[PDB]
C-alpha cells in the first residue's frame, strides 16, 4: 500500500482510506509550525537579467550568502520571484510517497531519483516548551503510543508532530541513512528540514539517523536492516526526560 502527497489534502476521503488500511491514521496537516506558546537579512547576489533567467542560470544558488548560512531569502530578495533559496516557504518539496513498511509502520520513499543535498520536506509540528513537553510525554505514555514524533529544535523548543504535522513525520530511522536534518532560519525563526546526503534512487525508502535520546524504560528494536545496525532506537543509554527534552 502507498499514497501520494495530494491524498492527504482531503480529510474525509483520507479518513475513509485509512479505515480500509490504504492510508495511515489521520492527523492534522499543517503548512508551518504552530507554537503552543508564542516566544519573544538580504543577500548580496546580483540580480539575474531576463536573458540569464531564460538561459537557465540559477538565482541565489551555491554562492548565495544566505543559502551558505542556511538562511532563506524573503520576498525582498534582489532576485525576487526567481530566488531559488525560498524552498521551505514555497513548499518546494521532493517527489515522495508514503508507504507501508513490513514492521516500522508507515514510511517515506522517493518517487523520482533525488540528487544529493535535495530538500525533501520540513519537519513541521506543534512547538512545545519544557513544561508542555512533559505534559505530552505523560499523555502519550498513558495512551500507550507506539510511534514517537518529538524533534529537538532549540533550547526550549521541541517540535511535536504527533497530532499536527506533515508527511515528514513518516521518515523512519536508519543506522546507515540517506537523509539528514538541517536547521534553517526562515523569517528570523528556526526550522528543521530533511535533506538527502547522497543520490537516492527512485523507489528507495528515505531515512535519517534519529540520534534518538531515549527516556523510556525500554528501547525499541531497530529494523533498519543495515550491516552496522545499532540494534535499538536510543542505542545503549537511557536518558532522563529532562535531558531528552534539552535540559
Amino acid at each position: 500500500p502507498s499514497c501520494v502527497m495530494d491524498d492527504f489534502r482531503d480529510p474525509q476521503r483520507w479518513k475513509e482510506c485509512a479505515k480500509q488500511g490504504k492510508m495511515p491514521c489521520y492527523f492534522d496537516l499543517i503548512e508551518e509550525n504552530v507554537y503552543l506558546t508564542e516566544r519573544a537579512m538580504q543577500c548580496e547576489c546580483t540580480p539575474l537579467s531576463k536573458d540569464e533567467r531564460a538561459q537557465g542560470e540559477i538565482a541565489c544558488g551555491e554562492d548565495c550568502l544566505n543559502r551558505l548560512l542556511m538562511i532563506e531569502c524573503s520576498s525582498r530578495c534582489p532576485n525576487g520571484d526567481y530566488c531559488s533559496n525560498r524552498r521551505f516557504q514555497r513548499k518546494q518539496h521532493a517527489d515522495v510517497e508514503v508507504i507501508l513498511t513490513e514492521k516500522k509502520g508507515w514510511g517515506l520513499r522517493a518517487a523520482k531519483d533525488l540528487p544529493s543535498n535535495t530538500f525533501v520536506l520540513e519537519y513541521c509540528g506543534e512547538v512545545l516548551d519544557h513544561k508542555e513537553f512533559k505534559a505530552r510525554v505523560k499523555e502519550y505514555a498513558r495512551n500507550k503510543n507506539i510511534h514517537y514524533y518529538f524533534m529537538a529544535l532549540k533550547n526550549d523548543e521541541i517540535i511535536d508532530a504527533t497530532q499536527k504535522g506533515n508527511c515528514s513525520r513518516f521518515m523512519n530511522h536508519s543506522c546507515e541513512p540517506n537523509c539528514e536534518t538541517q536547521k534553517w532560519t526562515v523569517n528570523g525563526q528556526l526550522r528543521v528540514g530533511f535533506f538527502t546526503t547522497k543520490l537516492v534512487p527512485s523507489g528507495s525508502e528515505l531515512t535519517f539517523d534519529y540520534q534518538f535520546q531515549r527516556y523510556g524504560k525500554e528501547a525499541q528494536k531497530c529494523f533498519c536492516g543495515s550491516a552496522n545496525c545499532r540494534g535499538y532506537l536510543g542505542g545503549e543509554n537511557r536518558v532522563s526526560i529532562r535531558a531528552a527534552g534539552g535540559k
Binding site: 505514555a141 514517537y148 539528514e180 538541517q182 536547521k183 535520546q213 525499541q220 536510543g234 531528552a244
Partner: peptide, 14 residues
C-alpha cells in the same frame, strides 16, 4: 517512568 519514548536530535550527517 514511561515504558517507551524519546526525542529525535538533529545533527549533520557524518
Amino acid at each position: 517512568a514511561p515504558s517507551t519514548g524519546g526525542v529525535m536530535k538533529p545533527h549533520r550527517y557524518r
